[PDB]
Ligand binder design. Structure first.
Ligand code: P6Y
Ligand code: K
Ligand code: K
Ligand code: ZN
Length: 357
């Protein structure tokens, strides 16, 4: 019963040359790592090394053009870096960005491989830059390559093509990139919880609404749980897990669970405006550990309050290590719009999941 951990300070080298205070900070990953040390969690884990994703591995989800452009940025002077970055929605690029994104993905490949070969039962990946906004053909929202989507395909490549992978994306933002990559795929179930505000929240697309259920053979295999009009927290996320995430996940019966674990829905985050607590994230982790025979890989996405994300991700690792869940607060009645949101998703996915009927 071993928990893997991957962290490599080389991923701090990616940085914003023009705004050194940009929230997607190098110290995001070092602060999470430090908190694991501080809580004496690090020594309880088995350290998994980082590695570079190969270009062939990036092609599991990304176009050769997109790979080539980000790859070319390694050699750019700052004037191309700034101008190239401004071509995307919410991206900054430094000469080290490409290599850091490669290390983020390869770190997660090594972690999935250790899980799937039985070297560890579960694992945590303290990586940046994030991935879930990255599309097949473009970078977006601080993300260059879709780490979680790539890891799902890498997992299938070392097991069998039809390996059932569940991606639970609890970053406060919609993982537009991962939704699109798997939208026609029934082997990868995508479930995202996200602040939506009727499309008035990044990434500002009705793609994130509850009625986007997947396409083709993927109908039913894309689950968007969109929050509107309310400062959501533990009671809403627990209710969403009880009524939607866990019933659908159990019916799907995944063989591997990946968490796109952004911590920007956390109390204190400067961007998300929500109030999920560290003990809330612990309970969400503990629930997912009941799936896939415990084969869970937690992948850092967003989250910008350094103290909040360090406490929150550490509590997740504590759960992976087998510690008992901390006690939740009394739990207020749901925000009424949260009930509306949950019921809209239930109506949207009742055609496909009998456990919701
Ligand atoms: O991945 C993410 N969260 O996990 C993520 C991705 C994209 C955005 C969009 N941009 C902004 O909100 C924005 C606008 C102006 C000034 N500063 C910002 C800031 F950097 F703070 F976000 C936000 C969050
Ligand atoms: K999300
Ligand atoms: K899907
Ligand atoms: Zn986010």
């Amino acid at each position: 019963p071993i928990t893997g951990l991957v962290y490599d300070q080389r991923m701090m080298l990616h940085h914003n040359m023009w705004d050194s205070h940009h929230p997607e900070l190098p110290q995001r990953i070092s602060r999470i790592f430090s908190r694991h040390e501080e809580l004496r969690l690090l020594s309880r884990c088995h350290r998994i090394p980082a590695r570079l994703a190969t270009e062939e591995e990036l092609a599991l989800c990304h176009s050769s053009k997109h790979i080539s452009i980000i790859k070319s940025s390694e050699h750019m002077k700052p004037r191309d870096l700034n101008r190239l970055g401004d071509e995307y929605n919410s991206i900054f690029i430094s000469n080290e960005s490409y290599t850091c994104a490669l290390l983020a993905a390869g770190s997660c490949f090594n972690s999935a491989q250790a899980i799937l070969t039985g070297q560890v039962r579960n694992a945590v990946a303290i990586v940046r830059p994030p991935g879930h906004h990255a599309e097949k053909d473009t970078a977006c929202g601080f993300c260059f390559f879709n780490t979680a989507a790539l890891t799902a395909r890498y997992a299938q490549s070392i097991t069998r093509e039809s390996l059932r992978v569940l991606i639970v994306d609890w970053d406060v933002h919609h993982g537009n990139g991962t939704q699109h990559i798997f939208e026609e795929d029934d082997s990868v179930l995508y479930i995202s919880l996200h602040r939506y505000e009727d499309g008035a929240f990044f990434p500002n697309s009705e793609d994130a609404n509850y009625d986007k259920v997947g396409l083709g053979k993927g109908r039913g295999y894309n689950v968007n749980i969109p929050w509107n009009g309310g400062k959501m927290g533990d009671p809403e996320y627990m209710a969403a897990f009880h009524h939607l995430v866990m019933p659908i996940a159990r019916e799907f019966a995944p063989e591997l669970v990946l968490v796109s674990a952004g911590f920007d829905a956390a109390r204190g985050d400067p961007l998300g405006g929500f109030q999920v607590t560290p003990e809330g994230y612990a309970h969400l982790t503990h629930q997912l550990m009941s799936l896939a025979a415990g084969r869970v890989l937690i992948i850092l996405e967003g989250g910008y309050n350094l103290t909040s994300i360090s406490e929150s991700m550490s509590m997740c690792t504590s759960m992976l290590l087998g510690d008992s869940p901390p006690s939740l607060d009394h739990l207020t009645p749901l925000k009424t719009s949260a009930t509306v949101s949950i019921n809209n998703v239930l109506r949207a996915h009742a055609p496909f999941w009998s456990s919701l009927r």
